[PDB]
């Protein structure tokens, strides 16, 4: 059927997005080698990552389910990783705004808050597709739930968003709403690997110490 070939193309698009985002690593400083399955130029692999992200977002929107919002997160990841260096990706931002307004509702026009709105929308796809088949891969074939990466989603959200609050006069993000978004964080959470729990409670300790919420 067209569903199987479309799902295989979506899986290859997500693999292309992850590989091409991983291709533009370590800033390509003097990377003039043979470059097998890579470009290894000044900004080529970031642009190819943006094109693969646009194609993956188009394929995931056409296939309208946990793999859908991974490319929506990866578009903001590509925008931020290119914005660590110089970046002017307004065309990819307009494509992401068009796809996100077609599927979701954006309703935002602020600098560096569109990524947070995209991540908050991107949690809702996994939240909707939770009531489905529990196992879909083979690396988690004997797992328990998709909660094991659902916690990594909002912790990488909190890590990328809590550093934006650095001053206290023009606070772009107000303490109360991210404290109450850490309020509904505390799910079931009992049985999990101990390294995961010591790292995730260390991140909650880090954000509370940086917030001043000492107790």
């Amino acid at each position: 059927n067209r569903s199987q070939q479309k799902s295989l193309g979506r899986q290859m698009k997500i693999l292309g997005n992850f590989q091409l985002l991983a291709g533009r690593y370590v800033d390509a400083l003097n990377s003039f080698v043979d470059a097998i399955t890579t470009l290894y130029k000044v900004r080529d692999y970031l642009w190819l990552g943006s094109a693969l992200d646009g194609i993956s977002i188009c394929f995931l929107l056409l296939s309208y389910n946990s793999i859908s919002i991974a490319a929506m997160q990866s578009p903001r990841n590509s925008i931020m990783s290119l914005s660590a260096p110089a970046l002017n990706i307004d065309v990819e931002n307009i494509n992401l705004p068009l796809l996100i307004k077609c599927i979701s509702d954006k309703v935002l026009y602020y600098y560096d808050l569109s990524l947070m709105h995209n991540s908050e929308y991107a949690p809702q796809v996994v939240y909707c597709e939770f009531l489905l088949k529990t196992l879909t891969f083979m690396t988690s074939c004997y797992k328990s739930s998709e909660f094991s990466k659902d916690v990594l989603d909002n912790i990488v959200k909190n890590q990328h968003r809590a550093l934006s609050d650095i001053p206290n006069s023009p606070m772009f993000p107000r303490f109360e709403v991210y404290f109450y978004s850490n309020k509904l964080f505390e799910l079931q959470l009992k049985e999990m690997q101990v390294e995961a729990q010591i790292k995730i409670y260390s991140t909650m300790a880090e954000v509370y110490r940086l917030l001043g919420y000492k107790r």
Binding site: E176, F179, Y180, K183, E186, Y213, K214, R215
Partner: protein, 147 residues
């Protein structure tokens, strides 16, 4: 069942009581020994945050349920001298507290009256525990009549 406390300014309790419905003769299963002092000290942070602000998330002496955390509704009250009247709400299921603000606000008002009656003693200085059985008798009759 509900855990009730009155906490000083230097983070110390002057009163603490736990009262339950008589159907559950033992109350708060396993939360009572460990969880309930710690989440109260956690809520002291956000009550300390909302004490100085003007427009809340009128009249600043009462305030609503301040957080919701493992299905427990935690309700606060701030006196004039800075004492904090944090009292939590437990159940096996979720609990509604805002419907009891016709009644629980009055409960905080006359236990504030009882605390003013305690404070007017010149022998009783602050940072002292309220070691009076008469106070217990009034607060459990108020717990009975404002259930």
């Amino acid at each position: 069942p509900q855990y009730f406390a009155i906490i000083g300014k230097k983070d110390n309790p002057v009163y603490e009581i736990e009262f339950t419905n008589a159907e559950n003769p033992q109350g708060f299963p396993q939360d009572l020994k460990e969880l309930n002092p710690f989440i109260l000290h956690a809520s002291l942070d956000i009550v300390e945050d909302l004490q100085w602000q003007i427009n809340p998330t009128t009249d600043n002496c009462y305030l609503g349920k301040v957080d919701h955390f493992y299905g427990l509704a935690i309700t606060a009250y701030i006196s004039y001298s800075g004492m904090k009247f944090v009292m939590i709400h437990g159940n096996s299921a979720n609990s509604s507290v805002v419907i009891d603000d016709n009644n629980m606000r009055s409960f905080y008002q006359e236990v504030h009256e009882l605390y003013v009656k305690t404070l007017m003693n010149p022998f009783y200085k602050i940072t002292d525990p309220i070691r009076s059985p008469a106070f217990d008798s009034r607060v459990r009759t108020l717990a009975r009549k404002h259930l």
